[PDB]
């Protein structure tokens, strides 16, 4: 891919974060805390899962950003509708307004319903996410493997403004404390 030149500066939106998350001062890193982070509840916060949105909203154009996933056992990445459900239980699917991939239990899968197996030869330490709003495309690239394609969602029904989406995952094992980090352009 040659998508890096639609690079956008993504920052995290504190107000949308699950109350156990810790967002860095520069709003470029997020990790799971070992407790509630002493914030008030609000209607934006994801209640059930360790999720947070980017501050940026997109309704047109081409956008590209990169995320560091080094040393993590579990995470979800992609984009979602601004109008996604925040409270209670839900699945990550295009029907629910999410275009995502994840790592879980040593397998990589795309967030279709049902989920789709990914074939990645080089486990990624950094993921590139490309959105073409007009084309209806969300694509994922393996930065560790020369930018190789991971997965493409096409004919997407965005149905409104889009936000960058992140899930740092639980840390029941003690092996998933590492942060997600937005990488420099
Ligand atoms: C049972 C249980 C409790 C937690 C800790 N916790 N985590 C989040 C992300 C949201 C609510 C919350 O209670 O994780 N599993």
Swiss-Prot record:
Domain notes: The coiled-coil is necessary for the cytoplasmic localization.
Assembly description: Homotrimer. Component of a SCF(SKP2)-like complex containing CUL1, SKP1, TRIM21 and SKP2. Interacts with CALR, CUL1, FBXW11, HSPA5, IKBKB, IRF3, SKP1 and VCP. Interacts with SKP2; the interaction with SKP2 does not depend on an intact F-box domain. Interacts (via N-terminus and C-terminus) with DCP2 (via N-terminus and C-terminus). Interacts (via C-terminus) with IRF8 (via C-terminus). Interacts with ULK1, BECN1 and with ATG8 family members, including GABARAP, GABARAPL1, GABARAPL2 and MAP1LC3C/LC3C. Interacts with TRIM21 and SQSTM1/sequestosome 1. Interacts with IRF3.
Domain called B30.2/SPRY: residue spans: 8-185
Organism superkingdom: Eukaryota
Role summary: E3 ubiquitin-protein ligase whose activity is dependent on E2 enzymes, UBE2D1, UBE2D2, UBE2E1 and UBE2E2. Forms a ubiquitin ligase complex in cooperation with the E2 UBE2D2 that is used not only for the ubiquitination of USP4 and IKBKB but also for its self-ubiquitination. Component of cullin-RING-based SCF (SKP1-CUL1-F-box protein) E3 ubiquitin-protein ligase complexes such as SCF(SKP2)-like complexes. A TRIM21-containing SCF(SKP2)-like complex is shown to mediate ubiquitination of CDKN1B ('Thr-187' phosphorylated-form), thereby promoting its degradation by the proteasome.
Organism per entry: Mus musculus
Name listed for the protein in its UniProt record: E3 ubiquitin-protein ligase TRIM21
Subcellular location: Cytoplasm; Cytoplasmic vesicle, Autophagosome; Nucleus; Cytoplasm, P-body
Family statement: Belongs to the TRIM/RBCC family.
Post-translational modification: Autoubiquitinated; does not lead to its proteasomal degradation. Deubiquitinated by USP4; leading to its stabilization. Autoubiquitinated.
Upregulating conditions: Up-regulated by IFN.
Full-sequence portion shown in this chain: 291 to 468 of 470
């Amino acid at each position: 891919h040659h998508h890096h030149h639609h690079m956008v500066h993504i920052t995290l939106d504190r107000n949308t974060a699950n109350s156990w998350l810790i967002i860095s001062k520069d709003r470029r890193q997020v990790r799971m805390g070992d407790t509630h982070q002493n914030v008030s509840d609000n209607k934006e916060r994801f209640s059930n899962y360790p999720m947070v949105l980017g501050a940026q909203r997109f309704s047109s154009g081409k956008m590209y950003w990169e995320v560091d996933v080094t040393q993590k056992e579990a995470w979800d990445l992609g984009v979602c509708r601004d109008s996604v459900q925040r409270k209670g239980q839900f699945s990550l699917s295009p029907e629910n307004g999410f275009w995502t991939i994840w790592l879980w239990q040593d397998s990589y899968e795309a967030g279709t319903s049902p989920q789709t197996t990914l074939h990645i030869q080089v486990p990624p330490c950094q993921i590139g996410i490309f959105v073409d709003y007009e084309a209806g495309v969300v694509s994922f690239y393996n930065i560790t493997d020369h930018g190789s394609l991971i997965y493409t969602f096409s004919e997407c029904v965005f149905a409104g403004p889009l936000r960058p989406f992140f899930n740092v995952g639980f840390n029941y094992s003690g092996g998933n404390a590492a942060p997600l980090k937005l990488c420099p352009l």
